Ligand binder design. Structure first.
Ligand SMILES: CN1Cc2cc(F)ccc2NCCC1=O
Ligand SMILES: CN1Cc2cc(F)ccc2NCCC1=O
Ligand SMILES: [Zn+2]
Ligand SMILES: [Zn+2]
Ligand SMILES: [Zn+2]
Ligand SMILES: [Zn+2]
Lengths: 360, 360
């Protein structure tokens, strides 16, 4: 069976399971079950399934070099699909909540969930809670007797928690640290002293790389019982590197990709986000460029946003990006090589993850 | 050592642990650690700690009848305190999110977290995420080698999930079920056909009773390794009964308790909530009373809210409440008795839970 149709089939199975359970054990009525079915479909489906499919691809890699009964191959691939859906639903939780937090309009060319007319924020905040709760229900049901259950649940929590901490680093990225204070409304930075590579890297490492790259890779290893085929520090290092690159591309596209192609009107400039473009621009600007950037950044006014875009275009940030891209190619290839000392197969899965990231 | 000072001491310990961990493993800076410290204190502290202290009281009960080394008594009480804080932090997560969902103003005579000037909804939604994530971090750290870890984490998830499903039942309680639909803005019910005792009971069972009563009782049993001293169906039945009673009192107080004493301006009438008062009023009203109630319920207009209050006062709902209260006294005493077949101690803890509920 091809991997993607397996993966999509298991979505239907897990949906049925969750909704059947709500009816037998949580007293749900058919109309609220329908509401939850629609919510799940709307929030979990229509992406590329990169994260969840990575769990399946890692597991397929190991299957090709490990002796197993056919039933065992099937069980492992079914666990990989379940595990992939936990990651997709964890993503779904964060997109629902982040779109409410950020007052976002669209996502993927469709309205954010909370903006649907029969949803509203009141329900959507709790729908997003449910999305994440479903990841646990899946796990406890499908993995109750599995030897990797403990390790999988402990990994998943950590990644969830890293993610939430990353969200805090992101939403507070335009504030001056020494001014954080629940009692006092937070001004935007005026010096941009915290728009540094190291501070950027911290935001991205926690907000994206743990759930997007580390967790799919390591879930593949756990459902395969293959964590001893790898040096976990190397898996972490490569995940964080690749994940950083992924976000740098997202940052660049928020600004320069046509909204119809983006799926989204990009607002990083108005939102005063600590983007790769802002940081890299500040890393090369002269005094006058820095002052013009300060006078225009983090303002809804379209005349000012267009000044920030003009500054970025004039500053030749494509040069810095190809330099960055070169260095990431270097380091990711070094790490892949180090990953072959213990697992050629695993290193090859990492290669494929890198290729899918480095092209899109 | 007295139970409450133990419990409060363990709060400080767990706080220190969480913030120290953020610094050593999650790259946090001191100012964001301070923000999280303040958030934790503001959201987790200043209640009565009923839920978390119930875990400690159940555990104390078992200690008084079970032979153990002093070090083991200390370990059990420390686990009970940790477990109690997981419940308090789970509550904190739901109050933060529910206050944002409901557009609430105050809670306990202080502003809702999201309304603090340096917080805002953008941060508060994610602060509430973190609150719940901290419950898992506590568990994995303090209970990593404990034999009850699996059972505790599986119970906790279920209770979390019941809670979220209860929140969905509550936020959708004024809608007609057959009209739920993400695509279509939801009208308030005009017939109130779903304002029934059974429908009310379902809302309350899931939204409150699992986290408020079931989880503290069963956590006490798990940290005591005492789940075999009870018939779990009886613990569930008693939890749900007592929990229902608790919410009926909250419902009555939302309407009739002075806001300065309530901690809150009560808005259940304006919010068109399926409250015990609404249901019980509809269960006894004549046609004219039902029509006046329909013309006035679920409106912000203070003239209409005062009409709904007048209808409730005229309808002598105190009578129905003392009748309800009588029946709950009957059934809770029956269940306590059934709980003595297997554990006098456990039954006595349930008695104390009932006494603290039935007086406040
Ligand atoms: C717990 N902590 C952060 C972390 C979070 C995760 F999600 C996954 C891995 C790691 N490990 C790196 C450092 C550490 O020990
Ligand atoms: C899982 N489900 C609902 C439930 C949720 C909980 F939080 C705790 C207990 C129960 N048990 C009653 C019925 C059932 O088996
Ligand atoms: Zn965001
Ligand atoms: Zn972006
Ligand atoms: Zn609410
Ligand atoms: Zn209330």
């Amino acid at each position: 069976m091809a991997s993607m149709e397996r993966f999509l089939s298991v979505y239907d199975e897990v949906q049925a399971f969750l909704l059947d359970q709500l009816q037998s054990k949580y007293e749900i009525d058919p109309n609220r079950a329908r509401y939850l079915r629609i919510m799940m479909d709307t929030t979990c489906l229509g992406g590329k399934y990169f994260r969840g499919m990575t769990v399946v691809n890692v597991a397929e890699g190991f299957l090709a070099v490990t002796q197993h009964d056919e039933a065992t191959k099937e069980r492992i691939l079914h666990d990989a699909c379940v595990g992939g859906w936990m990651i997709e639903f964890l993503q779904a939780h964060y997109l629902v909540e982040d779109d409410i937090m950020d007052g976002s309009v669209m996502r993927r060319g469709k309205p954010c969930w909370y903006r649907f007319p029969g949803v509203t924020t009141q329900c959507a905040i709790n729908d997003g809670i449910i999305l994440k709760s479903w990841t646990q229900i899946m796990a406890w049901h499908y993995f109750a007797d599995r030897p990797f259950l403990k390790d999988l649940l402990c990994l998943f929590q950590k990644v969830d928690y890293a993610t939430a901490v990353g969200q805090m680093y992101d939403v507070t990225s335009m504030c001056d640290s020494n001014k954080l204070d629940p009692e006092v409304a937070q001004p935007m930075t005026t010096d941009f002293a915290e728009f540094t590579p190291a501070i950027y890297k911290r935001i991205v490492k926690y907000k994206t790389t743990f759930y997007t790259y580390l967790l799919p890779l390591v879930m593949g290893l756990l459902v395969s019982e293959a964590a001893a085929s790898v040096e976990m520090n190397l898996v972490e290092r490569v995940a964080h590197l690749i994940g950083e690159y992924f976000q740098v591309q997202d940052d660049v596209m928020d600004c320069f990709t046509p909204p119809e192609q983006l799926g989204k009107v990009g607002t990083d400039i108005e939102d005063a986000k600590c983007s790769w473009l802002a940081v890299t621009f500040l890393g090369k600007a002269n005094a006058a460029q820095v002052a013009e950037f300060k006078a225009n950044y983090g303002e809804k006014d379209p005349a000012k946003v267009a000044v920030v875009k003009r500054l970025y275009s004039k500053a030749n940030l494509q040069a810095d990006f190809a330099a960055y891209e070169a260095e990431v190619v270097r380091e990711v290839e070094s790490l892949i090589e180090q990953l072959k000392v213990k697992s050629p197969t695993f290193a090859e899965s990492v290669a494929v993850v890198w290729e899918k990231t480095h092209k899109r």
